Amino acid sequence: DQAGKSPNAVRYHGGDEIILQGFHWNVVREAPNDWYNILRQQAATIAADGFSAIWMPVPWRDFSSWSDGSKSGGGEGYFWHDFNKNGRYGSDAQLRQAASALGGAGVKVLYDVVPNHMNRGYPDKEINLPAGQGFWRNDCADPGNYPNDCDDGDRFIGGDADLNTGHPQVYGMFRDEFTNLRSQYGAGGFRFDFVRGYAPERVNSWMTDSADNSFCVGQLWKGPSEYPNWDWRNTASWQQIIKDWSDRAKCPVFDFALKERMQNGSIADWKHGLNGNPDPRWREVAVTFVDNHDTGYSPGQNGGQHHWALQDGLIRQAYAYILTSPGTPVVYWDHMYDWGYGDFIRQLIQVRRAAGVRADSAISFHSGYSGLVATVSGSQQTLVVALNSDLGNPGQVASGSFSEAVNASNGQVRVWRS
Numbered sequence: 396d397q398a399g400k401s402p403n404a405v406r407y408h409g410g411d412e413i414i415l416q417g418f419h420w421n422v423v424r425e426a427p428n429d430w431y432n433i434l435r436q437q438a439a440t441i442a443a444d445g446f447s448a449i450w451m452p453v454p455w456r457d458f459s460s461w462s463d464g465s466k467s468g469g470g471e472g473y474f475w476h477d478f479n480k481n482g483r484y485g486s487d488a489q490l491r492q493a494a495s496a497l498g499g500a501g502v503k504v505l506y507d508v509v510p511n512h513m514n515r516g517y518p519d520k521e522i523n524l525p526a527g528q529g530f531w532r533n534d535c536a537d538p539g540n541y542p543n544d545c546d547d548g549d550r551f552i553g554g555d556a557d558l559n560t561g562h563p564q565v566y567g568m569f570r571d572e573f574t575n576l577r578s579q580y581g582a583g584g585f586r587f588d589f590v591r592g593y594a595p596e597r598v599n600s601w602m603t604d605s606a607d608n609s610f611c612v613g614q615l616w617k618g619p620s621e622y623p624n625w626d627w628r629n630t631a632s633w634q635q636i637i638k639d640w641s642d643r644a645k646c647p648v649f650d651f652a653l654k655e656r657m658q659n660g661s662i663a664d665w666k667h668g669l670n671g672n673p674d675p676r677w678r679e680v681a682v683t684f685v686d687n688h689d690t691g692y693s694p695g696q697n698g699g700q701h702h703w704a705l706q707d708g709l710i711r712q713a714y715a716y717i718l719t720s721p722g723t724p725v726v727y728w729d730h731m732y733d734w735g736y737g738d739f740i741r742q743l744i745q746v747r748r749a750a751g752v753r754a755d756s757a758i759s760f761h762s763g764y765s766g767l768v769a770t771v772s773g774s775q776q777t778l779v780v781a782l783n784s785d786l787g788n789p790g791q792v793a794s795g796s797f798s799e800a801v802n803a804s805n806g807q808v809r810v811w812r813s
C-alpha cells in the first residue's frame with residue numbers, strides 16, 4: 396500500500412485506495428447499537444473483497460431526533476453533541492474492537508468527522524460552549540447563508556448550531572480529537588463533512604496538525620447556482636468548483652461532477668466528471684461514488700434519504716465505470732452487502748487490481764460508438780470498457796491483444812484486458 400502525497404501535495408495516500416462506505420443511512424435504526432459488532436465480524440470479508448479502507452460512520456454520539464410529516468431521522472452522527480463514543484452504533488469498547496479487527500485485516504479506518512456544527516441544545520453533553528465568546532456563528536450578525544464574522548463558510552440550515560471553527564479554542568478542540576482518533580481508535584484518515592461550511596484551508600491545517608500523511612476526502616456538495624452571481628463559481632463547471640476546494644484543503648474530493656452527469660446526462664457524458672479529466676493533477680483528486688447515504692436508498696425506513704439516487708438500470712454500468720477508471724473509487728455498503736451486486740463488484744475490484752489502474756491512470760474516450768467507450772491505461776494492463784455500446788470488439792478502438800474480463804447484463808457491460 397503505496398502511501399505518498401500527489402505531485403501537488405494532495406493527501407491521496409498513494410493513489411491506489413479502494414474504499415467501502417461502511418454504513419447506510421438507517422443502520423442506527425436497523426441494527427441499533429450493533430453496527431460495530433457487525434463490522435468486527437465482517438472485517439475478514441471486507442478485506443477479502445479487496446477494500447483497502449473503510450469509511451466509518453461518525454464516531455461522536457448522536458441522540459438527536461427530528462420529524463417533518465412522514466419523515467423522521469436522528470442519531471446517525473451528523474448532529475452529535477459530544478466526542479463520547481458510546482452512541483447508536485455501539486460502545487467505545489466495540490468501536491475499538493471493530494477498528495482493531497479492520498486494521499488487523501489490513502483495512503485502513505477512515506472516520507467521518509463533522510466540524511461544522513453540533514447538537515447545541517442537547518441537554519446532557521460533555522461539551523458546553525457558552526454564547527457570547529465567539530464560539531458560535533450566531534455570536535455574530537447572521538444575514539444569510541454566507542460567511543459571517545464568526546464562521547468563514549456557509550451555515551447548516553438556520554446556522555444556530557454552527558461553530559466558529561476558526562476560533563482558536565474550537566480549532567484546537569477538533570485538532571485534539573483528530574489526534575485522539577488516530578492514536579486510540581486507529582484512524583488512517585478522515586472524511587470531512589459539510590466542507591462548504593468552513594474554510595478549505597482549515598482542513599489542510601487540521602491534517603497537517605493531526606495526520607499529515609493520512610488520507611482525507613472532503614464532501615463538497617454545492618452547485619454553481621448556489622454561489623453569488625458575482626462569484627466566479629456561479630458560472631463554473633462542477634469540476635472547477637470541487638477542484639478549487641481540493642487545491643486549498645490539499646485533500647481528495649468527492650466527484651460531484653461525475654455524480655451530476657450520472658443523474659442528468661447520458662452515459663456518454665460520464666466522461667465529464669473530474670475523474671475523466673485529461674490533466675492527471677485533476678483526475679487524481681477525484682473520489683468517485685455511485686450513491687452515498689444522502690443520495691441513495693438504504694434498507695429500512697422510508698427507503699432512507701434517496702436525495703439523488705441512481706436508478707437500478709444503471710447500477711452495474713455505474714460500478715463498472717468507477718471501478719475501472721481514474722480517481723479513487725468508493726463502494727456503497729448496500730450495493731455490496733444488501734442488494735446483491737457484491738459478486739459483480741468483487742470481480743471488478745479484481746480487474747482494477749490486476750490492471751494496475753490507479754488515481755492518475757490515463758483514460759481516453761472513443762467518439763465513434765454508442766454508450767461510453769474508454770481505453771484505460773493501467774500500470775499493468777490496458778482496459779477497454781464499453782457500456783451500453785454498439786462497439787463490436789476491443790480492437791476497433793485499441794491496439795493489442797485483449798481477453799474478455801467482464802461481460803454482464805446482456806453485454807451492456809463489457810471490459811477487456813490486454
Ligand SMILES: OC[C@H]1O[C@H](O[C@H]2[C@H](O)[C@@H](O)[C@@H](O[C@H]3[C@H](O)[C@@H](O)[C@@H](O[C@H]4[C@H](O)[C@@H](O)[C@@H](O)O[C@@H]4CO)O[C@@H]3CO)O[C@@H]2CO)[C@H](O)[C@@H](O)[C@@H]1O
Pocket residue numbers: 459460461468469470472473474509551552553554555556588589614688689700
Ligand atoms: O440546530 C440546527 C438546525 O436543526 C434542525 O435541523 C435538522 C434538520 O431539519 C433535519 O433534516 C436533520 O438534518 C440531517 C439531514 O437531514 C441529513 O441529511 C444529515 O445531513 C448531513 C449529510 O448526511 C452529510 O452527508 C453532510 O454532508 O451534511 C449534512 C449535515 O451534517 O444530517 C443532518 C443532521 O442530522 O437534523 C437537523 C438537526 O436535528 C432545525 O430543523 C433547523 O432549523 C436548525 O437550524
Ligand SMILES: [Ca+2]
Pocket residue numbers: 396397398407408409410411412
Ligand atoms: Ca494507499
Ligand SMILES: [Ca+2]
Pocket residue numbers: 511532546547548549550551557558591592593
Ligand atoms: Ca459554518
